[PDB]
Amino acid sequence: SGRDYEDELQSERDYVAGLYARLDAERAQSQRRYAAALREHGGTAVERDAEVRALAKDIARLNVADNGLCFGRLDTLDDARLYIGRLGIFDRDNDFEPLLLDWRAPMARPFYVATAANPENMRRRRQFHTLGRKVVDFTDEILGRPTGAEHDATNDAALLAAVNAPRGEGMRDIVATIQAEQDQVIRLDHTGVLVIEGGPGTGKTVVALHRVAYLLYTYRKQMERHGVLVVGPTPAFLDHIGRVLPSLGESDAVFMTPGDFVPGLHVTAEDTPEAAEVKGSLKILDVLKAAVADRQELPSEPIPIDLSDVTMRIDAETAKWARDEARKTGLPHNEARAEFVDVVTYVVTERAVARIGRGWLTRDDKHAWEKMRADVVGELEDHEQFNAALDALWPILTPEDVLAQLYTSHERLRAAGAPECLWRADGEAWTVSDVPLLDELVDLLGRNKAADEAAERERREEEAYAAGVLDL
Amino acid sequence: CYGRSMATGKLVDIGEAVGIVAAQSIGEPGTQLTMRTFDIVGGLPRVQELFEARVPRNKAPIADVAGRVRLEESDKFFKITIVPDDGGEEVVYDKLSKRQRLRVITHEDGTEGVLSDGDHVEVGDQLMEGAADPHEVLRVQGPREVQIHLVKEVQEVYRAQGVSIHDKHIEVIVRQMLRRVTIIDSGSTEFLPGSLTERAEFEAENRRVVAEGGEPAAGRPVLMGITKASLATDS
Amino acid sequence: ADVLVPPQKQEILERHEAEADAIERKYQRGALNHTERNESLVKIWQDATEEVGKALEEFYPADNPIITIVKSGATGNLTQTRTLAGMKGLVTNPKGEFIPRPIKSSFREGLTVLEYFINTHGARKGLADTALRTADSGYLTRRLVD
Amino acid sequence: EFVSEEAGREGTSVVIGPPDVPGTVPPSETKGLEFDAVLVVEPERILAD
């Protein structure tokens, strides 16, 4: 919190003010030429449209550029300032001397990829922490040996300078070794999985962030539309990261913890006890698959059908046959209800027409379509018992309820190869260890179609009744 | 109410078809307007976006209340909170993409610039640069102000592109776009709820009902488009 | 003869080609990308046309027929007058963007082969669009009438 | 004392301790951070936790 820092901060604020002034003026003249081209333009309709669109793109680019224009700055060894940003600003008067570089330039490269052991020609690197137009603070990152640097947000420079150790080989002049290690991590060409297992006191997190910057610049063309997912143990640490995170130009990060891997809910680390160590393990998959089969309950008592003449047709044979065939397609549970119903209805219509309707003495044009159709339909509409019966056998269910109907019953649990240390009173005191079991379950159960159709239908006729209902 | 016919230069006559006149006066210069690539370019697309009461792409939120603003901003987001002047409940607009910058005012004097904290806000005022949503205006401000806003926007579009259309044509069409009500509480009337009833029939029905005139029919206006409003016809 | 060419045109075009050279020097020096470059080139050869038209306005007498038919409000405008005695300037690609290589020749001097090739794009785009435009207008009118 | 003297400093000074004690946080929210001065109290309850 020195004074030289205030001097520098004010200087940089003045410079960015000048940049924003030029940006304001270019927006001004661009809106002016835009209005003009819109009114007359003199020329032809196609030239008019082209000029209109071009000036609109200029307006949009500048409008966006207003939000964090200058990322930072470079001081080279020949003492030539460079200012990096999301917009190129040149002076048309002094032969287009760069006042602000675009980060996508072959000359703003020693800002993502430069280290303290393999710099390019640089002596320093600054980052600026902006809100929308204001330079709150900045941090230097000297690419070499520091002595004391006013503000860094990690103080790395004053620690890298107070290294007091016995003379000798001395691990090759302590600083150089650290710098070369970091360089090896960052300038590495694997574009796959890297592990930086180090320890305390070595800056592994900052190194990882510089690594991510190097990668997101180098391969900014496969990424830049995907993101950077950064998980962590606590939102305090995540805000710390977000606060000393390099550019990631034109990309965006997504911060997370184990606990918010799910869309919507943010577990506050309830930390189910050590027996849940069997949840942080892949065997649990079986359990899920075995707890998602105990939901295909088999009828013990025969379910009564009352289609005005027909006897109860579904029973252990029918339900068993249908559950087996539904498990015999290799796809999720809520999409398998389809085959269950297809089979039950098949064997309750084709095998009830030739018995209860009248019987035999017609092999076509009555058995094939007519009684077929009547039985089919009378069954498809029985949303009271037939469908309640199915929902009793093949329930359309969801991840948020299986863990609850499993962690409590103590019988469904035993029917899943599951142990008994995972039983708890409340089935929705969701912990950290049962989050990945909710993301794994949406892929075993999947998503039906019928229910979604009916639901969006009702939703449509609910958004149409509130305002005016004539939709057709 | 119409005024003087522009052909005859005198007062309009009785039996003059003035809806077709407006239709044609708006259509004819349509080729003189910017178009879509075969909003950002506000030509025929914007006119189609208004006469059909469509939510815009660059929608801007308006003030449900008067009062002053507390402006917060974080990474890529604005959050405004309107502390009213009466002393009631403040409202908030939180997920405001900093892409849409703000509502610059450029006041007559002092060079206001952007909308800021501690500044004042009238009802129906716009906070973001862009294009308000007619239905919001309708519920907050009301039908008349809806109509006026729509005419202002259409004629802005045209003016910016060198076309002279007297606003009474826009007004005819708009009028026909806000010409109905959705009933809520039938009252003592021969009306169903959720139905679309023409405001004049509705007034005349809940007005002629004076016998036991202690609970008449209740209805709320609805903002339709020039294609639905042609489906919701009485013939 | 009545079609008169400003004499200042050459000074203008060379003064702007100087700045274009500067830009391309940057590009080859790495301080500039391949799109920002084209943006600057366009923003340069869009002003040269303004200056040529201004000169043309300040050089044509008033007894001239090509300026009389314009200033009388009879027909035309000064953009065509520039295109004819000045310079067609910039032209679009079939996409709809610009081409940083302008047309520094008029229809009086005579466009070269390439200039005459890259000026067919927008022309055909117009002759194509000019039915879809009518159709959109007619659709809006049909609605407004219904 | 630690707290109000560290206030006399210009660096973060978070304290760690078991959950029962008030005014001190567990050692599991400092998981991947750094501070300037740190005070840990009751090493053994947290060791055996």
Curated annotation (Swiss-Prot), chain B:
Q: Which residues bind Zn(2+) 2?
A: 1
Task: Please give the coiled-coil regions recorded for this protein.
Answer: none
Instruction: List the transmembrane segments.
Output: none
Lineage top rank: taxon: Bacteria
Q: Which family does it belong to?
A: Belongs to the RNA polymerase beta' chain family.
Subunit annotation: The RNAP catalytic core consists of 2 alpha, 1 beta, 1 beta' and 1 omega subunit. When a sigma factor is associated with the core the holoenzyme is formed, which can initiate transcription.
Q: What does this protein do?
A: DNA-dependent RNA polymerase catalyzes the transcription of DNA into RNA using the four ribonucleoside triphosphates as substrates.
Protein name according to UniProt:
DNA-directed RNA polymerase subunit beta'
This chain's source organism reads Mycolicibacterium smegmatis (strain ATCC 700084 / mc(2)155) (Mycobacterium smegmatis)
Organism taxonomic ancestry: Bacteria, Bacillati, Actinomycetota, Actinomycetes, Mycobacteriales
Q: Please state the gene responsible for encoding this protein.
A: rpoC
Covered range within the whole protein? 977 to 1220 of 1317
